[PDB]
Design a protein around this ligand. Structure first.
Ligand SMILES: *[C@@H]1O[C@H](CO)[C@@H](O[C@@H]2O[C@H](CO)[C@@H](O)[C@H](O)[C@H]2NC(C)=O)[C@H](O)[C@H]1NC(C)=O
Ligand SMILES: *[C@@H]1O[C@H](CO)[C@@H](O)[C@H](O)[C@H]1NC(C)=O
Lengths: 30, 599
């Protein structure tokens, strides 16, 4: 399954989760 | 000294700096610790340069002798300019475009160039990080994918699997810059991942990076250490170290030595980018920036050589392997030729046994073919740039037990180095924009950060083309040349002859409760300006002494293994003017526009 691709997927998942919460805190500033 | 009036108004007063920090608590960011500032500045200086540029120059330019110039310009210009950059940012309470515009309005070109230079360097450093994390994802296979030949490709059969995994499996490289093709999807995927990881770390700003910088500046040192204690157990490691520090005193008497030694101090210190100025402007007004510039330069001089010890330990092990393997092949040739008992012929008695065999059977011996085996030749096969990581270090790792582990640790380290450098370059592009108020003051800074990330991502599609490695070797060759030095010469000039070093040293007196020693004054007046000029004159004595010739891969034609090299098309001088003249002619260009808008 081209492990590299599986590693790409998991890494992207972590990054997207991180940026999502980051932008969330961006709107969560009250 | 130069008569600029109204300058006083452009800058805040020294009496008003005691009250400005209790009101810039809101509407300006602040470091959480001093460690968070020092680690973000060490991270900006330290990068893949000192991994595959500094160690190569340290040997190619007189070995031990090259250290003399490196340190010379390091203390004559590196430290002096660094101090000037930290102090001017902490005093005038703005980033790079802010500082130069205030020193004098026509100095706006300085910020524009610094912003243009940070955009072009960060554009190609994020393609290199794209490639690093492609090799990190492929590091989860017991037989690493650059370990064996694809069943066997004639191209791959020639040279080695590693040389095949980089130019074909990873690059799908063409044979010319005139040959562009299709976006390599996996390469684009990795480019996406690189820009995405950068946004998460720089989305908010120095605050978000402040957390990431720690690990991106810590992990590298831990891993670099783990590598030294492993490197020095691999046989032949010392051969490489000794090789790095053999002094060729004749290479000191060359105009090409002191230019590279000069250009290395400037890129290694992240000077003339502006990010450093922005980082310093967030400290307290009474922060000691004289002690900070000495500590950061001391760590940069020690890291530079410390990484060169780790690199040449691997070069020495890899060459000791090659040499031994070739010698073994030569021995097997003789034993197979004369049916000699195995173990009878040895590396020590091979020559005499060779003579005895030739004496016994000259005809048979004549048929026998023996390869040339010189450790020095293998030692002098070290590649400069990405080749050292993807072609040399990747192959030495496959000949090491726990191979995948070592590969993984090696790629997370390069990732961390590159990412810390990216924090600096991003700081250099975002802060000037806000100075221009480009972003609607409505849209949060995160919006601007994403815009910058997504805009630089779309331009980075040029390096995912089949010819994308030829573009990157050209941009890289003309991204840190004269422009960086030019910007650095005018920052020095503008603080000393336009804003006056008198105010500078006085402002220094106000912040560190004392004025700088004669050293700083002298360097900022003659030592730095004069020395930089001779580096500027060397450029048109060496760049003119060279030609626009770039190496190509070309699986077929000539000798595949041989590094086939071709010239550049006539339209490339348009690209070199864009990557050289543009970031060096906005400094006069804006200064001619502003002097004829008033008149
Ligand atoms: C350092 O390296 C240079 C380059 O190899 C040496 O210069 C050579 O000197 C010999 C002897 O005079 C000449 O035959 C070569 O033609 C020279 N090569 C070049 C490229 O000029 C130099 O002698 C070396 N010296 C030290 C101190 O190691
Ligand atoms: C890129 O890869 C494709 C196959 O996916 C191949 O047809 C093409 O020739 C390659 N281009 C270069 C220049 O290597």
């Amino acid at each position: 399954v081209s492990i590299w691709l599986i590693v790409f997927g998991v890494v992207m998942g972590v990054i997207v989760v991180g940026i999502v919460i980051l932008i969330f805190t961006g709107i969560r500033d009250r | 000294v130069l008569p600029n009036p109204g300058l006083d108004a452009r800058i805040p007063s020294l009496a008003e700096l005691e009250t400005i920090e209790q009101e810039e608590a809101s509407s300006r960011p602040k470091w959480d610790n001093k460690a968070q500032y020092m680690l973000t500045c060490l991270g900006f200086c330290v990068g893949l340069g000192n991994v595959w540029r500094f160690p190569y120059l340290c040997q190619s330019h007189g070995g031990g002798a090259f250290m003399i110039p490196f340190l010379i310009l390091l203390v004559l210009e590196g430290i002096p300019l660094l101090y000037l950059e930290f102090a001017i940012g902490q005093r005038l309470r703005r980033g790079s475009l802010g500082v130069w515009s205030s020193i004098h309005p026509a100095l706006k070109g300085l910020g524009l160039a610094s912003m243009l230079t940070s955009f072009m360097v960060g554009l190609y450093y994020n393609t290199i990080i794209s490639w690093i994390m492609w090799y990190l994802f492929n590091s989860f296979q017991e037989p690493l994918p650059w370990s064996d030949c694809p069943l066997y490709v004639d191209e791959c059969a020639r040279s080695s699997p590693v040389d095949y995994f980089w130019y074909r499996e990873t690059l799908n490289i063409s044979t010319s810059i005139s040959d562009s093709g299709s976006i390599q999807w996996w390469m684009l995927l990795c480019l996406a991942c690189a820009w995405s990881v950068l946004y998460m770390c720089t989305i908010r700003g120095i605050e978000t990076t402040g957390k990431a910088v720690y690990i991106t500046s810590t992990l590298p040192y831990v891993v670099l250490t783990i590598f030294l204690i492993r490197g020095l157990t691999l046989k032949g490691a010392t051969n490489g170290i000794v090789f790095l520090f053999t002094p060729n005193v004749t290479e000191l008497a060359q105009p090409d030595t002191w230019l590279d030694a000069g250009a290395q101090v400037f890129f290694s210190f992240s000077l003339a980018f502006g990010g450093l100025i922005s980082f310093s402007s967030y400290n307290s007004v009474h922060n000691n920036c004289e002690k900070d510039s000495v500590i950061v330069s001391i760590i940069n001089g020690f890291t530079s050589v410390y990484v060169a010890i780790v690199v040449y330990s691997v070069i020495g092990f890899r060459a000791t392997q090659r040499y031994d393997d070739c010698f073994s092949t030569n021995i097997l040739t003789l034993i197979n030729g004369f049916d000699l008992p195995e173990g009878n012929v040895t590396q020590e008695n091979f020559v005499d046994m060779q003579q005895r065999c030739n004496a016994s059977d000259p005809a048979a011996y004549a048929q026998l073919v023996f390869q040339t085996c010189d450790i020095n030749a293998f030692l002098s096969e070290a590649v400069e740039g990405t080749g050292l990581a993807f072609i040399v270090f990747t192959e030495a790792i496959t000949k090491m037990p726990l191979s995948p582990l070592w590969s993984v640790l090696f790629f997370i380290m390069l990732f961390c180095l590159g990412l810390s450098s990216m924090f600096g370059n991003m700081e250099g592009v975002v802060v000037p924009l806000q100075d221009l108020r480009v972003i609607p003051p409505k849209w949060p800074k995160e919006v601007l950060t994403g815009l910058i990330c997504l805009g630089t991502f779309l331009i980075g599609f040029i390096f995912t083309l089949n010819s994308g490695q030829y573009w990157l070797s050209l941009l890289d060759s003309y991204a840190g040349s004269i422009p960086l030095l030019i910007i650095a010469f005018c920052e020095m000039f503008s603080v000393v002859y336009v804003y006056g070093v008198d105010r500078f040293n006085k402002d220094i007196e106000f912040m560190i409760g004392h004025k700088p020693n004669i050293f700083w004054q002298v360097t900022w007046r003659v030592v730095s300006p004069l020395l930089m000029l001779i580096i500027f004159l060397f450029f048109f004595v060496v760049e003119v002494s060279q030609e626009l010739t770039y190496s190509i891969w070309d699986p077929g034609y000539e000798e595949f293994p041989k590094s086939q090299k071709i010239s550049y098309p006539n339209w490339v001088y348009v690209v070199v003017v864009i990557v050289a003249g543009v970031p060096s002619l906005t400094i006069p260009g804006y200064a001619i526009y502003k002097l004829i808008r008033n008149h």
